[PDB]
């Protein structure tokens, strides 16, 4: 009935007048809802996340035990962001970042912003300021276990201070989300594990700093160490696994695996070997691997070296793997 349509148009117009153009519109016409992603620095994890990376404008959480590889993963993410021209920022609340190693991983330290907040409040305030600034594209927070309320710093060891950090996190997310979506900024939180007392059933692990972040997060990643990597009697890397334990973009509960080699970072070409084997582009022959008939080498390390020394074949392999998966 047209008497309904006239009322509908009148109401929409009045809303738009009071609150401005673009306050309300058909969901099939709003191009700002479309999702956009940036690379995570490993092909396997980008496959695990269905859309091909981390979404812009959302919130992301990463946690694991100690020496898992969180900081190196986030530095590798920053690195790939900057090579496309974007601006980044780092907040080292634990007071432990190392410029030289961050350079070796590939970050450009002459343009990366940094900050070592005295308290958690100013950490979150700096994050809000940067988001409103509209000129920073990636932000990462070193640890939510280092974000002290101002009362704790001025108090004494042993005071209760019960539940303050949870209130801080709740207020922070509640205020930030809109600014981060307007400015098209990606924010990553790192978190440590603790253990619950008194739980009688289930996994007794937990993460620090209240429980609003898990509601407001869009992707949650879990990173753990599973083995050593050796060239002789001396270790040179670590085996890793990643679980996508939450997802608002594609289907959750997938896994990724890769190596982290000290001084270098994530080993990209090992992923090409593994995925070429999976997609039948690389012919496995027992301990020997062959590509299009030719024997490239024996063992994973040898095959990776062969690929490193023969760029064109690695190129075509990477493009085909991208096309299939």
């Amino acid at each position: 009935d047209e008497n309904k349509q006239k009322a509908l148009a009148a109401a929409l117009g009045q809303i738009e007048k009071q609150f401005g153009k673009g306050s309300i519109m058909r969901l099939g016409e709003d191009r700002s809802m479309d999702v956009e992603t940036i690379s995570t620095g490993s092909l396997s994890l980008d496959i695990a996340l269905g859309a091909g990376g981390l979404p812009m404008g959302r919130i992301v959480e990463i946690y694991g035990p100690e020496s898992s590889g969180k900081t190196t993963l986030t530095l590798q993410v920053i690195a790939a962001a900057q090579r496309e021209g974007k601006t980044c920022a780092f907040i080292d609340a634990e007071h432990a970042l190392d410029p030289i190693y961050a350079r070796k991983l590939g970050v450009d330290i002459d343009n990366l912003l940094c900050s070592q907040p005295d308290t958690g409040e100013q950490a979150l305030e700096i994050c809000d300021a940067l988001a409103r600034s509209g000129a920073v594209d990636v932000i990462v927070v070193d640890s939510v276990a280092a974000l002290t309320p101002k009362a704790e710093i001025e108090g004494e060891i042993g005071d209760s201070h019960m539940g303050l950090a949870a209130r801080m996190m709740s207020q922070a997310m509640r205020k930030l989300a809109g600014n981060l979506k307007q400015s098209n900024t990606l924010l990553i939180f790192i978190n440590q594990i603790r253990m619950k007392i008194g739980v009688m059933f289930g996994n007794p692990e937990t993460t620090t700093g209240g429980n609003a972040l898990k509601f407001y997060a869009s992707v949650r990643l879990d990173i753990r160490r599973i083995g050593a990597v050796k060239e002789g009697e001396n270790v040179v890397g670590s085996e890793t696994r990643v679980k996508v334990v939450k997802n608002k973009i594609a289907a959750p509960f997938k896994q990724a695996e890769f190596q982290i080699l000290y001084g270098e970072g994530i080993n990209f070409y090992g992923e090409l070997v593994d995925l070429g084997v999976k997609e039948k582009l690389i012919e496995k022959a027992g301990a020997w691997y062959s590509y299009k008939g030719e024997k490239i080498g024996q063992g994973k390390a040898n095959a990776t070296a062969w690929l490193k020394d023969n760029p064109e074949t690695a190129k075509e392999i990477e493009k085909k793997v991208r096309e299939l998966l």
Binding site: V199, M200, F201, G202, N203
Partner: protein
């Protein structure tokens, strides 16, 4: 402590008021109100005492709490959620029961547990071969009879239609959650 609770129970009746924390501490034989405060808080956390604004609001039990599920067949997700209680004596069961679980599947029919039943568990981590136990295998729970040898553990069924489940300790994590002690059925 029970003696502390009794001290309030009779002191309040004898004098009409609860004793001060200093009085309780002095009776306890230590020079600190913290001695009385710790016991008062422990009783309060037990559900026996109420506290408001640092003072006792009063001196004012639901039985075994049903906590989660468990799978007789393939492993099932482990997630504690205390949905309700049941009023039944711990003394009934052989080692004292601690909580209840809901059973899905039919892989223990011969012994006498079946779909939809409640299983009483006694919390512990010391168990030996041949007992009925509850195990978690990478955040999933199962109930079966144990047979441990070397680096592999066998979780056997008690029904000829099901085959045993075997886990290698070098690949998956294995934590024993307790020991089964009985069953309650109300369907």
């Amino acid at each position: 402590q029970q003696e502390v609770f009794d001290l309030i129970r009779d002191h309040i009746s004898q004098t009409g008021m609860p004793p001060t924390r200093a009085e309780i501490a002095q009776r306890l034989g230590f020079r600190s109100p913290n001695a009385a405060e710790e016991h008062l808080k422990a009783l309060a956390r037990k559900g026996v005492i109420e506290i408001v604004s640092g003072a006792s609001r009063g001196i004012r039990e639901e039985g075994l709490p049903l906590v989660g599920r468990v799978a007789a067949g393939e492993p099932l997700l482990a997630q504690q959620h205390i949905e309700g209680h049941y009023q039944v004596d711990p003394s009934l069961f052989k080692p004292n029961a601690d909580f209840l679980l809901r059973v899905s599947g039919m892989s223990m029919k011969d012994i006498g547990i079946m779909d939809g039943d409640l299983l009483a568990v006694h919390k512990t981590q010391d168990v030996r071969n041949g007992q009925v136990v509850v195990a978690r295998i990478d955040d999933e729970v199962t109930v079966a009879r144990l047979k441990k040898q070397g680096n592999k553990v066998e979780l056997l069924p008690e029904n000829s239609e099901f085959k045993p489940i075997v886990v290698d300790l070098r690949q998956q994590s294995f934590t024993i959650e307790g020991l089964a002690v009985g069953v309650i059925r109300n369907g």
